[PDB]
Write a protein that binds this ligand. Structure first.
Ligand SMILES: NC(=O)c1ccc[n+]([C@@H]2O[C@H](COP(=O)([O-])OP(=O)(O)OC[C@H]3O[C@@H](n4cnc5c(N)ncnc54)[C@H](O)[C@@H]3O)[C@@H](O)[C@H]2O)c1
Ligand SMILES: NC(=O)c1ccc[n+]([C@@H]2O[C@H](COP(=O)([O-])OP(=O)(O)OC[C@H]3O[C@@H](n4cnc5c(N)ncnc54)[C@H](O)[C@@H]3O)[C@@H](O)[C@H]2O)c1
Ligand SMILES: C[C@@H](O)[C@H](N)C(=O)O
Ligand SMILES: C[C@@H](O)[C@H](N)C(=O)O
Lengths: 309, 315
């Protein structure tokens, strides 16, 4: 049995059915503190900050594996660092301790480029590098990777993690995140509405499309334990672009599209992150690969977003 | 008014009177979960994992600065990672948040070479480097540095830290760490007994003598704001040695002692850490310096330990 925490978020929304298709509907349980449609898949309310809740769920459902998605992200984190610490720090600690006590074969955690800071090289960054995050989210996330690796080295709990870039998707609505301009922009485009972008025109960031994001997570999950070396902190990426680049490419498709730049705190967050990642380790150790290049993602998004409008 | 957290430990035991001497006994409050003689300086019971206790102390004594020493060290930490997490991680958060909410001007935190891991370069490591610790202790400590820096950048709270190497001292006996052998060996030397060392004969580690350690922390506390660029994570060191080197140098003074090597878990810990540090940043930004080189530390420790053990009577 697989438990997914924070199932209602950007990734959860799609991962749950992905897991059900791969491993069977009876074998997944979705969980969050906020409920959404899981298409029949079993759902339970679970606050990761309550260790007890976790202990109870893991027992009652005979949980074998956990995809621990619950968290506060970079923007919200700057708005409410105490909340981020509680959910991310406390929450992740609770998950690890609970998993370690019980028979938890595997815990998979989505980490982030948010673990990087200004001292981290901006281009082709390898996984082993400077990690001096400047956001409460980032601090919590590097802590997560370190804890995870510790639990593995110390207790033999199989914790695995990769570092996602910005994820572009259509199934779940964006949530005003630092990288979410890359999703919002498509909504505006299909309506031929001028977009007001909160990141600088030339703010380059690594990104990837959700189909590849889901595949990566699952490939990491599936990898053979004795075959991972790095194990936690795998950089993964598909492409790097700036808001003006993404806009220009969209406009090639939807020429009436316009944009204006009104940068805010989220730009400042982004500025602390690298521009592009080296994802060799993930490819070598577990065969991470990308099926959707930028063009494909752009057209797929326009296709899906107009049509769901 | 200065509060010291974890004052009963190796560092606290000496920092408390060091602080009182410099700023006055009335302006220093010692605190710990375990009391020990403070030589007339005010002591209060305080468990840092209990936020309400911190709040009460800070309120009552109008605390202006906190030297936050409370914590579980590398070895003890591996025996009880859950204790280390609770004390180190949530204790530090509690301190930071309390200071912020109250009007504590400065917080100083002693970090550690424990923040480093196998991937960290072994020689003359600088402050900005790979930080992938493999002890719970080390995880908490890097978290502490990051949180401390966050508290400055986010809220404007003046949080500072340096990274200590192993510290050698004679006033208090360290118990819960990996670098302790460098204190232990002197007791055996002075008694002319065989020392059983728990680290490999070749296990190089950076180290420094307490006097220099105390000065460093206080110098960082007093440093001009305008030069504090790195702010958190300053590497500091005096010298690097292996147990076989230290033994050999002590033997130069006291020929009639010996050593055997029976490595334990602690050696595995030490193996993950770098051998030597580059402390340039500390010297550049706040004037870090060392007064006790290796020889002077060895001779001073022999002196004081001999007196402590009645090899040479107090006069
Ligand atoms: N989306 C991305 O581009 C991205 C990139 C890197 C890392 N990540 C990581 O992936 C995970 C989820 O990402 P997402 O985009 O789906 O986030 P999201 O904001 O869409 O979803 C997060 C979920 O966490 C839930 N939550 C908050 N507090 C909780 C608590 N105490 N107990 C249980 N649930 C709680 C929210 O209600 C929400 O449904 C996080 O760990 C995040 O840091 C995401
Ligand atoms: N001694 C060193 O070589 C060295 C090196 C690097 C960093 N440091 C740091 O210096 C600080 C103290 O070092 P030390 O060598 O004196 O340690 P120590 O083990 O000698 O003393 C630690 C003190 O922490 C106290 N303590 C434990 N839990 C507590 C709690 N919940 N509330 C209040 N007090 C609590 C203990 O009772 C003890 O008196 C730590 O933060 C440590 O990580 C020390
Ligand atoms: C990708 C990750 O950093 C997240 N989407 C954020 O905006 O914080
Ligand atoms: C190195 C420092 O953290 C402490 N002396 C230890 O042994 O843990």
């Amino acid at each position: 049995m697989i438990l997914v925490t924070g199932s209602s978020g950007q990734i959860g929304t799609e991962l749950v059915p992905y897991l059900a298709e791969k491993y069977g509907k009876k074998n997944v349980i979705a969980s969050d503190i906020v409920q959404r449609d899981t298409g029949g898949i079993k759902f339970i309310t679970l606050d990761v900050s309550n260790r007890d809740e976790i202990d109870r769920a893991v027992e009652k459902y005979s949980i074998d594996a956990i995809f621990h998605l619950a968290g506060i992200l970079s923007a919200k984190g700057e708005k409410d660092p105490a909340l981020a610490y509680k959910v991310n720090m406390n929450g992740t600690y609770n998950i690890l301790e609970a998993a370690k006590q019980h028979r938890v074969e595997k815990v998979v955690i989505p980490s982030t480029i948010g673990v990087f800071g200004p001292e981290t090289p901006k281009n082709k960054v390898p996984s082993i590098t400077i990690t001096r995050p400047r956001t409460m989210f980032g601090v919590t996330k590097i802590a997560a990777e370190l804890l995870g690796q510790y639990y593995y080295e110390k207790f033999g709990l199989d914790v695995r993690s990769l570092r996602y870039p910005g994820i572009i998707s259509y199934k779940a609505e964006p949530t005003a995140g630092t990288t979410d301009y890359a999703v919002e922009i498509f909504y505006y485009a299909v309506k031929r509405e001028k977009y007001k972008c909160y990141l600088a025109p030339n703010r380059a960031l690594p990104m990837m499309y959700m189909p590849d994001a889901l595949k990566a997570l699952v490939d990491l999950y599936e990898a053979d334990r004795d075959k991972l070396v790095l194990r936690n902190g795998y950089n993964v990426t598909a492409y790097t672009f700036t808001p003006s680049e993404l806009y220009s490419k969209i406009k090639e498709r939807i020429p009436e599209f316009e944009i204006e730049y009104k940068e805010d705190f989220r730009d400042k967050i982004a500025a602390t992150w690298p521009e592009s990642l080296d994802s060799s380790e993930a490819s070598n150790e577990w065969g991470f690969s990308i099926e959707y290049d930028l063009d494909r993602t752009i057209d797929d998004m326009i296709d899906h977003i107009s049509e769901k409008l």
